[PDB]
Every structure is written in C-alpha cells, then in structure tokens.
Amino acid sequence: EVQGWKQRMAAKELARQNMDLGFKLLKKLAFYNPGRNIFLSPLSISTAFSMLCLGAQDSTLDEIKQGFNFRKMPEKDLHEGFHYIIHELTQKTQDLKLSIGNTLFIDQRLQPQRKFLEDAKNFYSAETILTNFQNLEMAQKQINDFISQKTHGKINNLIENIDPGTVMLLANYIFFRARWKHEFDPNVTKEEDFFLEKNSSVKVPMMFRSGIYQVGYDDKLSCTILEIPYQKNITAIFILPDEGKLKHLEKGLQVDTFSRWKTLLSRRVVDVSVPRLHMTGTFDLKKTLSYIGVSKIFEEHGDLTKIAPHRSLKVGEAVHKAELKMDERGTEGPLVVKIDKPYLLLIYSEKIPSVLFLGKIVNPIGK
C-alpha cells in the first residue's frame, strides 16, 4: 500500500511526459493532415518504446530516451513506473475493460533471448510470437488473427502491409470500455445535426443528460471545457473550440494547460449533448516517431542484440492502434453544452494521472 510510493511517483512523472507527447503528436498530425479525425493513445505508444529499451543499447537506446524524454529518472524507475501504470489500468470488470497490448512478431529463424522475454513480460505484459515472415500474406493473416482473438474482436486488421525483409514487427494496441458515473438514457438519444463546416452537416446519434458536471471556459485557448466522469477514477474531457479557433487550440495545448483548467472548472448543472463514438486510429509508428526524432530503432546498428543475437536486427515495422466505444452505458440512479461541431477528446485517468486517449473528432460517424 505505502510500499509502491516510488512506483506511483515515477508513474506521475511519466504520465506528465505522455501528456506533452500527446499534444506534440496531435499538433504535428493535424498540421500535415487537416480536416481528418486523429485518434491515438500517447500512453500506449510510450509503453511500446519504453519496453524496447529493455532490449536496446547505445545510440538506439539513447535516441528513444531523448525523443520520448525518459532521461530524467533512472532506467529502473522508468520500467517500474510503466509496470505500475499498466498493472493499475489493466482490468476486465463490469465498470472497466482496458488493456494495453505489446506484441513483438519475430522471424521463426531468430532466437529471442530469455532475459529480454522475462523482463518484457514481467514489467509490460508484452509477449514475443515467432512468425514465418518468408510468407508475407500468411504472416499478416496470423498477426491480425492473433490480436483479434487476444482482444476479443476489439482490435482487428492491425497490419495492412508487411515490407519484404521484415524480421521484427512491433504491434501496440489499446482498447477501452467503461461505465459512466451516471448513465445516459437510450430513450433520450436522438439523431442530431453535427456541423462538419459552418455550411455543411450530417445526422449523428446524439446522447443527452442534464445533471452536475465540471464545466468551464478558457479565454486564452478560446474553448469550452466539459468533463463527464466514468465509474472508475477516469474522466472524459470534451474540449470544444470557438468558431474559427480549432488551430489556435491545437497549437496552444501544453502540460501547464491542465493545472490552468483546474481553476476554470466548477461543478454546475449542465444540459449536455454528446455524440456516440466508435473510434479507431491506426498509425505507422516509423512515420509518427519522426515527429519526436526517433529513427535508429528502425535501422540496423547492432544495438538490439539483447532481443536476438543477430547483428543486422532492427524493428522493420511498427504499428499503433487505439480503439474506443462511447455510448449510454453507466451506473444506474442549467448551462448548455452542445458537442455538435469538431472537438477534442481527452480520456484522462485521475489516479495515475495519465492521458489514456487523445482524439480530434471532425466527424463522429466518419473515418
């Protein structure tokens, strides 16, 4: 209880760092891809490359730690911190279904080392699965089926392409199902307009509830903040930019922003309209990580011999997939906040405190 203090402290500092990462990834992703939905888990992304530090050495290890900012604390604390984060969040209960998966798919000719395997399992619950990469079509079919089975059909078609010569593929995935502190009534959910532009709109299933919620307005970022709590100590933070202020919001988000919003939010009676969601986000981590200058893990440098003793070993391919369902489900028993235009969604763990998911929702029924 008391013992686990250092694990929580390390986790509190790492969660501060995944918040920054998340805002950096969204800002980059939205700059290159405007007008599109972005849905990732900066926390799950981080566990994948922190797990790899258990098997990386020299220039590769150093670049991962610099890019991800794992440099402030000792390596022992980094791994014990992430072990704590994963152990606390991983659940299969009536209230919360949450899992962070990390699977290394390595060529069946190679021999993953006992020590790396025990460490990855013990600290991250990460597993290595031997694959026949000489048959690329069958390998993709085997990987996708392994994950679909593992996640009970929550994480499907993770891999779309395998480059020839790939001997090591990293698969990082997260799914989420949670009950709200107070359920929405399905009988009150109606098809409503979601404005894709000021001029254009589509009909979306819109949920409605009236009750007490932590609500506020940020005049610096020009946005409305609404928080809807889950039954377990997790919160859905809805950030609704003002008409013409979406870019300003994306460029303005930082770590200090949260402690600033704490003084802007108060518990008030709000008439809430929130779209239902079934979001997925798939990312090629070789491209994504170029935003934080991490590339050596994807190149041959003789730095991964702790994973498998072959000098030419690199991570050939790395994919992230985030999945979330947002509906009326919750625990059974005014201002106006209408989430009917493009918005940001932060799934925030309060007990860690970590950013589990970060989404840019331009269309709740599209991409």
Which tokens is 277 given?
């969601």
Resolution number, Å: 2.2
Do the domains at 1-180+276-367 and 181-275 have one common CATH topology? Answer: no
Which tokens is 213 given?
């919620």
For residues 219 and 6, give the distance between their C-alpha atoms in angstroms, rounded to a whole number: 37
For residues 287 and 56, give the distance between their C-alpha atoms in angstroms, rounded to a whole number: 20
For residues 204 and 207, give the distance between their C-alpha atoms in angstroms, rounded to a whole number: 10
What technique was this entry resolved by?
X-ray
Q: Where are the domains of the chain?
A: 1-180+276-367, 181-275
Helices (H), the chain: 5-32, 42-51, 58-68, 75-89, 114-119, 136-150, 246-252, 256-261, 285-288
User: How are beta strands 168-178 and 190-195 bridged, if at all?
Assistant: unpaired
Which residues is 357 bridged to in the sheet?
A: 347
Which residues is 310 bridged to in the sheet?
A: none
Encode 202-238: b = buried (16+ Cβ within 10 Å), e = exposed. Answer: eebbbbbbeeebbbbebeebbbbbbbbbbbbebbbbb
Sequence-ordered list of residues with C-beta below 8 angstroms from that of 185, at least 6 positions apart, any chain: 208, 209, 328
Nearest CA-CA partner of 349 in 90, 155, 113? 90
SS3 30: helix
Residue with tokens 């009236």, as numbered in its chain: 210
For residues 76 and 52, give the distance between their C-alpha atoms in angstroms, rounded to a whole number: 14
CATH of domain 1-180+276-367: 3.30.497.10
**Dihedral sign, Cα of residue 367, residue 254, residue 256, residue 49:** positive
Which tokens is 34 given?
């405007």
User: Yes or no: is domain 181-275 CATH 2.30.39.10?
Assistant: yes
Helices (H), 230-330: 246-252, 256-261, 285-288
Question: Distances in Å between the alpha carbon of 199 and those of 33, 98, 341?
Answer: 21, 38, 12
